[PDB]
Amino acid sequence: MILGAVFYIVFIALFFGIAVGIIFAIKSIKLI
Amino acid sequence: MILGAVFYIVFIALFFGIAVGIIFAIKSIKLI
Amino acid sequence: DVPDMGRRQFMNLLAFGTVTGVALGALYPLVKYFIPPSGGAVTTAKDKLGNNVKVSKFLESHNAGDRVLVQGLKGDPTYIVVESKEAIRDYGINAVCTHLGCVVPWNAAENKFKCPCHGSQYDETGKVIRGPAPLSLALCHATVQDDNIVLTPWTETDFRTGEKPWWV
Amino acid sequence: DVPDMGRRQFMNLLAFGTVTGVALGALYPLVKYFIPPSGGAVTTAKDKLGNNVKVSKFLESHNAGDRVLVQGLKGDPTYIVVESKEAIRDYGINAVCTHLGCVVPWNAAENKFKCPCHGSQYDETGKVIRGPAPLSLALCHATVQDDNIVLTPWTETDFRTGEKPWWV
Amino acid sequence: TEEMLYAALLSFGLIFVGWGLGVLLLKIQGA
Amino acid sequence: TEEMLYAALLSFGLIFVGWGLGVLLLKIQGA
Amino acid sequence: MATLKKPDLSDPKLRAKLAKGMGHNYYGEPAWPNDLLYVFPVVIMGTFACIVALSVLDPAMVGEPADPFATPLEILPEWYLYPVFQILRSVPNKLLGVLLMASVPLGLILVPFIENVNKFQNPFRRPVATTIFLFGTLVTIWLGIGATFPLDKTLTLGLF
Amino acid sequence: MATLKKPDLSDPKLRAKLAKGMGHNYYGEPAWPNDLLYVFPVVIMGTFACIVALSVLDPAMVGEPADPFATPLEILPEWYLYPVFQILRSVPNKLLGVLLMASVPLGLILVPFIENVNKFQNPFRRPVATTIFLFGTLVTIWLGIGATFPLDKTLTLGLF
Amino acid sequence: MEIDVLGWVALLVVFTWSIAMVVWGRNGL
Amino acid sequence: MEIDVLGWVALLVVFTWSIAMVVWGRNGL
Amino acid sequence: YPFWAQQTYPPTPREPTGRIVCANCHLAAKPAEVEVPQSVLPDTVFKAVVKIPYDTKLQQVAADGSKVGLNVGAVLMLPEGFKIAPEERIPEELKKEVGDVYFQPYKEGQDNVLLVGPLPGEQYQEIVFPVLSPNPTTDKNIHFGKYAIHLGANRGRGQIYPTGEKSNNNVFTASATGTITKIAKEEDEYGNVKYQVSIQTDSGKTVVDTIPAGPELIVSEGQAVKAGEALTNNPNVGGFGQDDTEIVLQDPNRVKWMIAFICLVMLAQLMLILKKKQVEKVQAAEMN
Amino acid sequence: YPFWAQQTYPPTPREPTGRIVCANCHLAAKPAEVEVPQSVLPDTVFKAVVKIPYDTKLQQVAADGSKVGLNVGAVLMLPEGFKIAPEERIPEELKKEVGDVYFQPYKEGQDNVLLVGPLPGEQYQEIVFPVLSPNPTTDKNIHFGKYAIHLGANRGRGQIYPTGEKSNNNVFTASATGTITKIAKEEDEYGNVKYQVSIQTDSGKTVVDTIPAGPELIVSEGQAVKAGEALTNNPNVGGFGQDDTEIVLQDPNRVKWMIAFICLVMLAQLMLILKKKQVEKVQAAEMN
Amino acid sequence: MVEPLLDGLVLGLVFATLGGLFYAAYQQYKRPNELGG
Amino acid sequence: MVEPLLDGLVLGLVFATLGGLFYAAYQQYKRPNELGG
Amino acid sequence: MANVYDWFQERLEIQALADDVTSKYVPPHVNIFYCLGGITLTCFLIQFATGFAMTFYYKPTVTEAYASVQYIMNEVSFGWLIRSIHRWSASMMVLMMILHVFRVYLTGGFKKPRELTWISGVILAVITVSFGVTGYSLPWDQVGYWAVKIVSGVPEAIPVVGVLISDLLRGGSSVGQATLTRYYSAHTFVLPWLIAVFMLLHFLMIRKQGISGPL
Amino acid sequence: MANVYDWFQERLEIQALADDVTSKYVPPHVNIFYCLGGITLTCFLIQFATGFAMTFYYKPTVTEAYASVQYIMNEVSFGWLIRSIHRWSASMMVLMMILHVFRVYLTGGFKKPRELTWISGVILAVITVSFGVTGYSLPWDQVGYWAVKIVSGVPEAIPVVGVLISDLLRGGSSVGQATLTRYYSAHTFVLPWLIAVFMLLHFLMIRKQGISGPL
Ligand code: HEM
Ligand code: HEM
Ligand SMILES: CC1=C(/C=C/C(C)=C\C=C\C(C)=C\C=C\C=C(C)\C=C\C=C(C)\C=C\C2=C(C)CCCC2(C)C)C(C)(C)CCC1
DSSP codes joined into one string, D14-39: HHHHHHHHHHHHHHHHHHHHHSPPPT
Residue ranges making up the domain that contains H81: 67-160
> Domain limits at L288?
255-288
Q: How far is CA P200 from CA G40, L49, P119, P130, P206, in A?
A: 20, 53, 13, 18, 10
CATH number of the domain enclosing P64: 1.20.810.10
Domain count of chain L?
3
Residue K243: give its domain's CATH number.
2.60.40.830
Ligand 1 pocket test, pick from O41, O43, O44, O114 with the greatest ligand atom count within 8 Å of Cβ, gives: O41
Closest approach of chain C CAs to the CA of B27, in angstroms? Answer: 10
Contact criterion met (CB < 8 Å) for N34 and P91: no
CA distances to C75, P104, P148 from P134, rounded to whole Å, are: 24, 28, 8
| Three-class secondary structure of residue H77 per DSSP | coil
Same domain, G61 and G76: no
For ligand 2, the distance from its centroid to the CA atom of residue N9, given in whole angstroms, is 24
Q: Is the peptide bond before L53 cis (omega within 30 degrees of 0)?
A: no
Burial O70-101 (b: 16+ CB within 10 A, else e): ebbbbebbbbbbbbbbbbbbbbbbbbbbbbbb
**From residue I28, how far is each of D43, H26, H154, I23, L7 by CA, in Å?**
72, 20, 42, 4, 91
Judge whether P172 is closer than 8 Å to chain C, CB to CB: yes
Rounded to an integer, what distance in angstroms lies between the CA atom of residue P72 and that of residue P54? Answer: 8
Q: Are residues K98 and K201 in the same domain?
A: no
Chain O residues at the K interface, defined by Cβ less than 8 Å, are: 73-74, 80
Q: Minimal CA–CA distance to O87: which of P62, E16, H60?
A: H60
Q: Residue G34: give its domain's CATH number.
A: 1.20.5.510
Resolution in A: 3.1
Helix axis angle, O191-209 to P4-12, nearest 10°: 70
Question: Which of L264, L265, L272 minimises the CB distance to D15?
Answer: L272
Is there a binding annotation on residue P86? yes
List, in sequence order, every residue forming a beta bridge with G30; answer none if it has no partner.
P25
Domain boundary among H66, H99, H114: H66
Helices (H), chain O: 4-12, 14-21, 36-54, 65-74, 79-106, 115-136, 142-153, 163-170, 177-185, 191-209
Chain F hits for N8, Cβ within 8 Å: 3-9, 11
Q: Mind telling me how many Å the CA of P110 is from chain O's nearest CA?
A: 12
The dihedrals phi and psi of K107, each to the nearest 5 degrees, come to -165, 160
**Sheet (strand D121-122) strand order:** D106-107, D112-114, D121-122
Measured between its terminal Cα atoms, the distance across chain K in Å is 88
Same domain, G76 and G111: yes
Identify all chain C residues contacting P153, using CB atoms and an 8 Å cutoff: 100-101
Q: Do H48 and C19 touch (CB under 8 A)?
A: no
What is the phi/psi pair of residue L107, to 5°?
Answer: -165, 160
M/B Cβ contact: 3+ pairs below 8 Å = no
Nearest alpha-carbon partner for P48 in P83, P20, P86: P86
Q: What distance in Å separates the CA atoms of residue K127 and residue K154, rounded to the nearest whole number?
A: 12
> L207 and L279, same structural domain?
no
Starting from the CA of residue H42, give the closest ligand.
1
Contact O15, O54 (CB under 8 A): no
Residues K19 and K70 in one domain: yes
Which regions of chain K does DSSP assign to beta strands (E)?
Answer: 33-35, 39-40, 45-51, 71-77, 83-84, 104-105, 113-120, 126-132, 145-155, 196-198, 208-210, 239-249
CB-ligand 2 contact for P206 (6 Å cutoff)? yes
Q: Please report how the helices P36-54 and G40-57 are oriented relative to each other, as an axis angle in degrees rounded to 10.
A: 50
Q: Which residues of M make CB contacts under 8 Å with O?
A: 1, 6, 9-10, 13-14, 17-18, 20-22, 24-25, 28-29, 33-35, 37
Q: Kindly give, in sequence order, each residue whose CB lies less than 8 Å from that of residue K143, ignoring residues fewer than 6 positions away.
A: K136, K249, O73, O74
Q: Tell me the chain A residues in contact with residue F7 when contact means C-beta distances shorter than 8 Å.
A: none
Shared domain check, K92 and K114: yes
Give CA–CA dist K236/K29, Å, rounded: 10
Pick the closest to residue P133 from P191, P80, P176 (CA basis): P191
- Whether O33 and M37 lie within 8 Å, measured CB to CB: no
Chain B residue with Cα closest to E18: B12
Distance, CA of F15 to CA of C50 (rounded, Å) = 56
How far is the alpha carbon of L245 from chain G, nearest alpha carbon, in Å?
11
Residues within a 6 A CB radius of ligand 1: H 25, 39-40, 43-44; I 22; O 24, 26, 30, 34-35, 37-39, 41-42, 203, 206-207, 210-211
Q: Which residues contact K99 (CB under 8 A, 6 or more apart)?
A: K123, K124, K128
Other chains touching P, judged by 3 or more CB pairs under 8 Å: C, D, G, J, L, N, O
Q: How many Å apart are CA K152 and CA D42, to the nearest integer?
A: 49
Mark which residues 9-28 of J lie under 8 Å from L by CB.
Answer: 10-11, 13-14, 17-18, 21, 24-25
Mark whether G122 and G76 lie in a shared domain.
yes
Touching check for I24 and chain H: CB below 8 Å?
no
- Of all residues in chain L, the one with the smallest CA distance to G5 is L287
Q: Does L120 lie in the same domain as L67?
A: yes
Neighbours of chain K (3+ CB pairs under 8 A): B, C, D, H, I, O
Residue G39 alpha carbon, nearest atom of ligand 2: 1
CA-CA distance, G31 to C34, in Å (whole number)?
Answer: 48
Using CA coordinates, name the residue in chain P closest to G31.
Answer: P25
G105, G115: one domain: yes
CB contact under 8 A, C108 and L17: no
Query: Which positions of C make up the binding site?
Result: 97, 99, 115, 118
Q: How far is CA P11 from the centre of its chain?
A: 35
Domains and CATH numbers, chain D: 1-40 (1.20.5.700), 41-168 (2.102.10.10)
Nearest CA to ligand 2 atom 42: P38
The SS3 of residue L151 is: strand
Atom of ligand 1 nearest to the CA of H42: 27
Q: Residue L214, by phi and psi: left (phi above 0), alpha (psi -120 to 50) or beta?
A: left
Element (H, E) at L127: strand L126-132
CB contact under 8 A, D63 and K164: yes
DSSP per-residue letters across J11-29: HHHHHHHHHHHHHHHTT--
- Other C-beta atoms within 10 Å of K247: how many? 23
The answer to whether O24 is a known ligand-binding residue is: no
The DSSP element (H or E) to which P38 belongs, if any, is helix P36-54
Any binding-site annotation on P43?
no
Q: How many CA atoms lie within 13 A of P164 on its CB side?
A: 7
- The best mutation among O124, O207, O212 to test binding of ligand 1, ranked by most ligand atoms within 8 Å of the C-beta, falls on O207
- D102 in a known ligand binding site: no
Chains in contact with L, counting 3 or more C-beta pairs less than 8 Å apart as contact? A, C, D, G, J, P
Asked if residue H72 is part of any domain, the answer here is yes
Residues L37 and L139 in one domain: yes
Q: Please tell me whether residues K141 and K246 are part of one structural domain.
A: yes
In angstroms, the separation between the Cα of residue K208 and the nearest Cα of chain D is 20
Task: Out of G38, G42, G43, give the residue to mutate to test ligand 3, the one with the largest number of ligand atoms within 8 Å of its CB.
Answer: G43
Question: What is the domain-level CATH number for residue L260?
Answer: 1.20.5.700
Domain for residue H131, yes or no?
yes
Same domain, K77 and K182: no
Q: What range defines the domain where residue P179 resides? A: 1-215
Question: In chain P, how many domains are there?
Answer: 1
**b (16+ CB within 10 A) / e for L67-82:** eeebbbbbbbbbbebb
Helix locations, D35-147, DSSP H = 58-61
Burial class (CB in 10 A: 0-12, 13-18, 19+), A29: exposed
Q: Measuring from atom 41 of ligand 2, which residue has the nearest CA?
A: P207
Domain count for chain G = 2
Distance CA D146, CA L33 (A): 56
Strand K39-40 relative to strand K239-249, pairing: parallel
What separation in Å is there between the alpha carbon of N12 and the centre of ligand 3?
12
> Are the Cβ atoms of P79 and D33 closer than 8 angstroms?
yes
Whether K287 and K152 map to the same domain: the answer is no
Domain identity same for G47 and G110: no
N20 lines ligand 3 (CB under 6 A): yes
- Residue O199 and residue O41 in contact, taking contact as beta carbons nearer than 8 Å: yes
Query: Side-chain half-sphere of F11: how many Cα atoms within 13 Å?
Result: 21
What separation, in Å, do the N-terminal and C-terminal C-alpha atoms of chain M show? Answer: 50
